[PDB]
Every structure is written in C-alpha cells, then in structure tokens.
Amino acid sequence: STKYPIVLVHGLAGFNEIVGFPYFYGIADALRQDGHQVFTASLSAFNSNEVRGKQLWQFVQTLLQETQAKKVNFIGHSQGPLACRYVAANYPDSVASVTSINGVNHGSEIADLYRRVMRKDSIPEYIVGKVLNAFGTIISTFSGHRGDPQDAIAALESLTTEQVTEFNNKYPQALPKTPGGEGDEIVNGVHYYCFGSYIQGLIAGEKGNLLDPTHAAMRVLNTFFTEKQNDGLVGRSSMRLGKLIKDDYAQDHIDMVNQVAGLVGYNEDIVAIYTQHAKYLASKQL
Ligand SMILES: [Ca+2]
C-alpha cells in the first residue's frame, strides 16, 4: 500500500450526480481492495485550470488535515493533471507525485477546432455537423439523453492550445523539452509520471467498445486532429508530463477511465493500469 494517500482528480464536479456512477469507473474500489487509502476530487469543469488548481488545493489541505498524511499522490485524467500541476508547483511539500493519465498537458486540437466553429471561423458545415453530433452523442450517452447537447462543451474552453500554452508558461514543471519527449521524473522533490493512449485498429475489432456509443464518436473526433495518434480529445504528444510509463494503449480518452461503465477496447484491463501503478508508486517509497 502507498505511504501517501491517492487522490483521483478529474473535471466535472456534477458527474456522479448526473450520470449515477463515478468518473473513474471502478477504480477507487479496486485501489481500496489493494489496501490503499483513496479519495476523489471532482473539480469544476466550466472554469479555468487555475480555478480548478485552487479548488484542488483547498481539498488537499482539508484531506491532509483529516489523514495526517504530509503529502498526496495525485492520479489525474484529462483536466485533472493541470490542476494537479498547479498544486505541485505552488505547494510541492504537500505533493508526493503527479501521475497524468491522458492529461491535456499541451492542449486539445478538438477544443481548438470547436473554438474555430464557435467563432464561425470558416469551418465547412459538414465538419461542424460531424463534430457537434459526436459531442452530442457522448453527452447524451452519459446523461441518458437528459438535458442540453452542447452546453457541456464549456469544459473545452480551458483546454485549447492557447489556454494550455498560457497555463504551461505559468507552471512549466516536468513538461518535455522536445515535443513528443518525456519530462523530468523529479522536479522540486515531486515525482511526475504519465500514461496515455491513442485510438488504433479498425472499429470492428474493438470488442466491448462495440456496445459503447461514445467510441464511434471519439473515432469521428480523432479524424480532425493534425496529430494522427490521438485519443479523440488529446494528441498523444500533448499528454506527456514527467516520466513516461506507457502510452500506446489502444484506447480512446474515456476508455482510459474505464468508461462507459467498463466498456473499453480489446478486452484490456483498464483498472489494472491503475492498481499496477499504485504498486509502482509504493515501490518508490511514495
Ligand atoms: Ca469505451
């Protein structure tokens, strides 16, 4: 079991309420079965990465008080690793490690494209239709066709390349020096690790994902990236932070959090990525 408690971090504070199950599907339960102490910070998706960082620091202060641990091990997905990086940069004594899983560490090309769409920047109507349809599909899969089909796109405003480049200028710690490289494993006494994935193979071979309507949507979005290797939301290169563990899983962005409800690609054991890593962290004296 880890020395320091594990804090799972993601955006969409309302997820569990709206969807009816956790964002990290099955993962905290699996970790606890392995003896680790585990908490989840579900951060505000519709605001900036610095607002989420501040929220996460308030949560961490409260958690450190309740545990008497001196530090935490963050495991973030998507928006999560940026808020984790804010806390590690500002409050390194409180952070043992930052593990980023498909983090939007250098921006999302699909957030960039939506911004070109939102602003009417000469994107053809057929592309607009396919992007909005894909977003709607994913939204409605999770919300049970309940509610608005675009609103939750507000989450991408803080994930554009422009916004994330600004964030990275403030919080450069552990980023790669060469695009597509790795960062330093230890920066200011904090350990940084990354995982990622990119969509691979023809859709008919996907197994469980053939029952998950979000997968084909992710595949539509994947086709609009300049970076070929992408998970539907973020390019493989953009995920990099600290030391690479593994990033060639054949998984879309939400497959990597075991979604929807354990429907993932190729019979891969997503939860095992996390439990194996928690053992690795414990092996590093974290
Ligand atoms: Ca899936």
Residue numbers in the entry: 2 to 287
Text from the published report:
Nevertheless, crystals of the free PMLVG protein were obtained and its structure was determined by X-ray crystallography to try to gain insight into how the I118V and E130G mutations impact the catalytic efficiency. The overall structure is nearly identical to wild-type PML with the main structural difference being a change in helix α6 near the active site. Helix α6 contains an amino acid hydrophobic patch that has been proposed to be involved in binding to fatty acid substrates. As a consequence of the two mutations, helix α6 changes from an α-helix in PML to a 310 helix in PMLVG that orients its hydrophobic amino acids, particularly I154, into the substrate binding pocket and towards the DEP inhibitor. The net result is a constriction in the size of the substrate-binding channel. The PMLVG channel is large enough to accommodate a fatty acid substrate suggesting that PMLVG should be capable of hydrolyzing pNPP despite being in the closed conformation. Notably, assuming that the closed conformation was active, the tighter binding pocket in PMLVG compared to wild-type PML would be consistent with the lower KM deduced from kinetics. Another structural difference between the PMLVG mutant and wild-type PML is the loop region connecting helices α5 and α6. This loop is visible in the PMLVG structure but absent in wild-type PML suggesting it is more disordered. Soluble PML and PMLVG had T50 values of 45.6 °C and 40.5 °C, respectively, suggesting that the I118V and/or E130G mutations destabilize PML in solution.
